[PDB]
Structure formats: C-alpha cells, structure tokens
C-alpha cells in the first residue's frame, strides 16, 4: 500500500492521490491520480505555466497479462 | 521502449534518462531503468533550480525494484 513506504505523492509539485483497485495476482493495485492540472509552485499555489501528468508503467499481472498503471505524477513545462 | 511511447522524460521539470538493463535468464529480459538528469528541477526560466529536487519514482515489479520516472519535490507544503 504505496503511501506507507513513500512520501512523494504528497511532497511532489505534481502531487497525486492513490485509488484502490481490486480483483487476480496481485489482487490489489494502487492507481495514481494527479490532484491538479497545474503544478504547485515555490509558494504553494497552483501554477498553470505547467501541467501535472501521470507516469504510466506497464506491469505484468496474472495466464500472463500486461496492463498500464499510473505509478505517480510528474510536472511538464513548455520551456526547453 | 518507453522513450517512444512517452515524451515526458524530456519535457519534465525533473527530466530523466533511460538505461537498458538486459538479462538473458529473466522475463521480460529487457527493462528500461530511469535515472534523473539533475539534482535540481527546471524552473520557469529554463534553469536548474535547487530550491527543489528531482527524485526517482520507484516501483515494485513482478519478474524487483525499478525506477519508472522522476518527479520534483519541494521542502514546503
């Protein structure tokens, strides 16, 4: 149950929530869901010069099946 | 290869690079391991800013611990 072993969901500038999902092995998988469209900035405000996006990971579950789950969020910027 | 399903590794405020990790006696023999590009995060100016850090997002995977991508953390709520 991911929270219990990692803070990042809360300390990220693109913070995310975790949704319970049941079924299968593993029986319970936690999906990540960005809290915001914007990213939270150096003050704690929602900044719309960037966006929160899920980082997806293809994990193999159970014959064999590969499905895509959001592992957490990152912040993307138009500037480079 | 993620690199060509998703673009984010490049456009993130905490951009990352990927590393091939091939193991013959292992399925899936190929896993792509992410590694943050910087200690800091890219800011609005496009510079590395050390008021925040790029950190790897770790995941348990059925085949071990894998770095899937990076997010940016601040010391403030």
């Amino acid at each position: 149950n991911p929270k219990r072993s990692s803070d990042y969901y809360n300390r990220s500038t693109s913070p995310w929530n975790l949704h319970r999902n049941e079924d299968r092995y593993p029986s319970v998988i936690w999906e990540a869901k960005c809290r915001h469209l914007g990213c939270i900035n150096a003050d704690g405000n929602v900044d719309y010069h960037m966006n929160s996006v899920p980082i997806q990971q293809e994990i193999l579950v159970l014959r064999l099946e590969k499905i895509l789950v959001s592992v957490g969020c990152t912040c993307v910027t138009p500037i480079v | 290869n993620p690199k060509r399903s998703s673009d984010y590794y490049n456009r993130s405020t905490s951009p990352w690079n990927l590393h091939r990790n091939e193991d013959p006696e292992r399925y899936p023999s190929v896993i792509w391991e992410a590694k943050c590009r910087h200690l800091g995060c890219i800011n609005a100016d496009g510079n590395v800013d050390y008021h925040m850090n790029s950190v790897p997002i770790q995941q348990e995977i059925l085949v071990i611990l894998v770095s899937v991508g990076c997010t940016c953390v601040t010391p403030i709520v």
Partner: antibody
Amino acid sequence: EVQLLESGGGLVQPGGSLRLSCAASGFTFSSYAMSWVRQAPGKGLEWVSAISGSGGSTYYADSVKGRFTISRDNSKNTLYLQMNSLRAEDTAVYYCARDLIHGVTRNWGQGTLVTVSS
Amino acid sequence: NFMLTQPHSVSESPGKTVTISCTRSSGSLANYYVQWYQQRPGSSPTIVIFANNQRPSGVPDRFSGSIDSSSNSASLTISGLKTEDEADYYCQTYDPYSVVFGGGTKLTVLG
C-alpha cells in the same frame, strides 16, 4: 514522531576504521536524503557527508573525501558511515540528520561520540 | 566551496529585538534555501527556521528569517527576547554539491 538513533561510536586508533549506524523511524525512510554532521568537543557544527533517497547519489566534505563512505539500506531503514584512515581531528559527536531536499535538514539524532586516540 | 560568516556572539536585554546575520562568501545566496538551528548546551541541534522563513509548528513566532540578496547574507531575528532564548545559533545553506554551516553565534540575555 521522527526518530533517529545513532550507534557504533567508541574508541579508534589513529589510521584506523569505524562504522556508524543510524536507525530511523517515524517516516518513509526511502523518500529522504540523509546526511552526517559532526561537532568536535566545544567547537562548531561541520557537515560531513550526504546521500540521496535512492542511495545513488553521494556527497562528501573536502576533509573526508576518499576516507569516508556514506551508504544506506532502505529495507533495513538504516543509514551508514564507513570511516577509514581516521585522524585525531575526526574526534567528534556524529549526528544523523534527515533532509527535505539536498541541503535542508529538518531532523537531528542524539549523536554518538567518536574518539580517535592512541 | 564557500563560507558562511556569522558573529561570534550577540547580546540583548529581555524584551528586545536581536539580529543574527549570516554572510555567504561566494555563490548567490537567494539561489539556495537557508536554515537556522538552535543548540542548547549538551543537546542536539533543534531547527528554528528552514527554507529561509518557514517556521516549524512548535517554534514561537518571535523567531523569523529573511534573506538579503545585495549583501549576500541571511538573517535570523528574535523579537521580544526571553531568557530561554539563550543558546547557540547556526545558519546553514548549501550548493549543488556542498552543505555548509556557519561558525555559530552565542546568544546572551543581559541583566
């Protein structure tokens, strides 16, 4: 409640070797950079060394480069400092500290005394 | 690397304001967060201020932090000074590789 318990202090011979252990609790250890800070008896605080959450990034003060090695074990919730080729000037209380980000420490341990003497 | 210079001591009577400053030798101060620590004798350092001016729940609001770009220095200020403030105080900051503490400042409460 954040808790950090240093361990493995004692007496070492000059040119000798010692390893410290810090058992952390009260927080998701894997999401925090950690560092060691020392203070010689009656003197100031002196940064020693730091490590990223993953353990894949490593930092040292000029006085301890190549001699010291910082490491960690997130499954065992423990921070380490491996101290090689000790000098009289390494004699200090060694503190375990938790970082919000590299360079920003939010919590300190109670420390452990290292005495490098003959 | 760099040096953080703070006075060896500051002194004021109860009720007053006290300013301990911390000057950064090289590198832009406002590029990096500054932290402040209290050490009461025989005890572990306690944080007072982190990230320039963020105060932990539990630290009285008489303590406050700020930065000064032009003199490349940071300051802790303690209004309404009390005899329980008597202690050592350390400023602290870093750069992309090093973390650096100041030499500490012994605070005395007069009278």
